[PDB]
Design a protein around this ligand. Structure first.
Ligand SMILES: O=S(=O)(O)C[C@@H](O)CN1CCOCC1
Ligand SMILES: [Ca+2]
Ligand SMILES: [Ca+2]
Length: 536
């Protein structure tokens, strides 16, 4: 059997993450000062007689500084108050910020708040073109619309064209904030990534910065980073001891990139166990993906697929040696999961992730069959198979395993493919297909999403690209509506799904695959998040 030529670049990281020993002295000093700064900051939030604009800016700053997870109660109480008071009487900057912060937190504030800023056409008054802070907040707000917010249809185009026009002459760091925003809006960004940029590039350079907040933000960021580095070392040791690097050399070695993905889903200390479990899964299904894609024969993949469905160590003999390696590791990983959850009495819930893995692997096999037969399905049939092969139903389910307050009813809700999950899956599917179209067309993949789309509708590659973009825009409006209260499950279980969508946007920015090619996109992120501390 002549296998295909391996052409994945090695891990760019070597072992620089394998061993990290926390300096307990520094950690305890940071935590002790953070405790004091946390209380000071709580008192800023609870201060009476604050103006609306002042309150919204405080909340926004604390969120962008990445320290709002300390104040979920306080911030919710305040936004709820603001939501229920309906004092509609402000300027563009405050109105746009009010709208965004309320919507991001699930408060269904009416988009009518923007009507005073528009003419009879629903087009924004061009007289606002010289209000940069208004334009910026409108811009950010434009990204949180649902299907009921067509009044905001023009906001993105309007704010973008005038922000671009104004940017070169703005003072710093406002210029850099505007420029960054035009490239990466806050709502669709990975929170830690935007937080790192905001702290170091913007807030630290603001003449008006609050010193208590800056200090709090730098210490908290660097302390959590210590945890993230301990987690990544622990995960690096686990991966090294699997040695897929050598025994399965055909597969992408990207456990660091997988950790960045898990960090994007949640960064908070309380999700440490959830994070470690998740990254192991992303890493392992990545192995399986490359087994189907870039190594295994048709006959081999059939056997592998059927053994996964049956899920039993007795099936290993029916597999080639190299497939036995990953197959035992997969079964082992889930036994580890059950054991790790045993003391919380939550072992039983692991079955949900297992069934989603089986689903993924079934659809991998279908994808291979199609490729071998040279079959180009209609878009509907393509999607019925390729949505699961994003792995996103699977990763979302996996993300709940370590979350201590996840219940059976939460998994039951997720198992029904709720709308917010479906949207996140679609975004991953259509962005991936837009980015990887030309590469996979050269590899002979006649069953790529874009190809299917072209042949089905009889349209050019350009028009097919656009239709997929539309599906992405539709899906983000669905995610946004999916966050509005009342929510079908607690918000804590929506945020990972939202964050999975963000990860797509961030990983495939400027239409390239940053997971397969981490050097351009992911590498600076990983360095900013997991190598370099923020200089204090
Ligand atoms: O290279 S593609 O195969 O087109 C896209 C893959 O990166 C998708 N998987 C890989 C493993 O991590 C989860 C997503
Ligand atoms: Ca693949
Ligand atoms: Ca793909």
């Amino acid at each position: 059997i002549v296998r295909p030529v391996a052409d994945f670049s090695p891990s760019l990281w070597g072992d620089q993450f394998l061993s990290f020993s926390i300096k307990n002295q520094v950690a305890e000093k940071y935590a002790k000062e953070i405790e004091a700064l946390k209380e000071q900051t709580r008192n800023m939030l609870l201060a009476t007689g604050m103006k609306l604009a002042d309150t919204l800016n405080l909340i926004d700053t604390i969120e962008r500084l990445g320290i709002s997870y300390h104040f979920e109660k306080e911030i919710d109480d305040i936004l709820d108050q603001i939501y229920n008071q309906n004092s509609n009487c402000n300027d563009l900057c405050t109105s746009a910020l009010q709208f965004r912060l309320l919507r991001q937190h699930g408060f269904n504030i009416s988009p009518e708040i923007f009507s005073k800023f528009q003419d009879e056409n629903g087009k924004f008054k061009e007289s606002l073109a010289s209000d940069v802070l208004g334009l910026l907040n409108l811009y950010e707000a434009s990204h949180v619309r649902t299907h009921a917010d067509d009044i905001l249809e023009d906001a993105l185009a309007f704010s973008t064209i005038h922000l671009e026009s104004a940017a070169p002459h703005l003072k710093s760091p406002l210029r850099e904030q505007v420029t960054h925003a035009l490239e990466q809006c806050l709502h669709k960004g990975v929170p830690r990534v935007e937080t790192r940029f905001f702290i170091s590039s913007i807030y630290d350079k603001e003449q008006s910065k609050n010193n208590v907040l800056l200090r709090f933000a730098k210490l908290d960021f660097n302390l959590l980073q210590m945890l993230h580095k301990q987690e990544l070392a622990q995960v690096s040791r686990w991966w090294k001891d699997l040695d897929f690097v050598t025994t399965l050399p055909y597969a992408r070695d990207r456990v660091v990139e997988c950790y960045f993905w898990a960090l994007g889903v949640y960064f908070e200390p309380q999700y440490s166990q959830a994070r470690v479990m998740l990254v192991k899964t992303i890493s392992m299904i990545s192995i399986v993906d490359d087994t189907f894609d870039a190594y295994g024969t048709v006959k081999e993949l059939e056997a592998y697929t059927d053994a996964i469905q049956r899920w039993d160590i007795n099936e290993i003999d029916r597999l080639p040696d190299y497939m036995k390696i990953s197959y035992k590791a997969i079964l082992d990983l889930y036994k580890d999961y059950e054991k790790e959850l045993s003391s919380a009495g939550r072992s039983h819930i692991v079955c949900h992730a297992i069934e989603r893995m089986k689903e993924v692997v079934r659809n991998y096999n279908v994808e291979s069959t199609w490729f071998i037969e040279g079959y180009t399905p209609p878009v509907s049939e393509y999607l019925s198979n390729a949505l699961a092969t994003t792995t996103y139903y699977y990763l979302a389910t996996t993300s709940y395993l370590g979350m201590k307050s996840a219940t059976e009813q939460d998994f039951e809700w997720l198992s029904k493919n709720p709308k917010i999950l479906e949207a996140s899956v679609i975004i991953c599917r259509v962005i991936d297909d837009t980015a990887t179209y030309e590469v996979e067309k050269s590899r002979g993949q006649i069953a790529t999403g874009i190809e299917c789309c072209m042949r089905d509708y009889g349209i050019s590659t350009k028009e097919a690209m656009a239709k997929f973009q539309n599906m992405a825009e539709t899906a983000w409006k669905d995610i946004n509506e999916g966050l509005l209260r009342p929510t079908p499950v607690s918000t804590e279980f929506l945020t990972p799904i939202l964050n999975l969508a963000r990860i797509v946007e961030v990983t495939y920015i400027h239409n390239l695959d940053g997971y397969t090619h981490p050097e351009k996109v992911l590498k600076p992120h990983i360095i900013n998040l997991l190598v370099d501390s923020i200089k204090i």
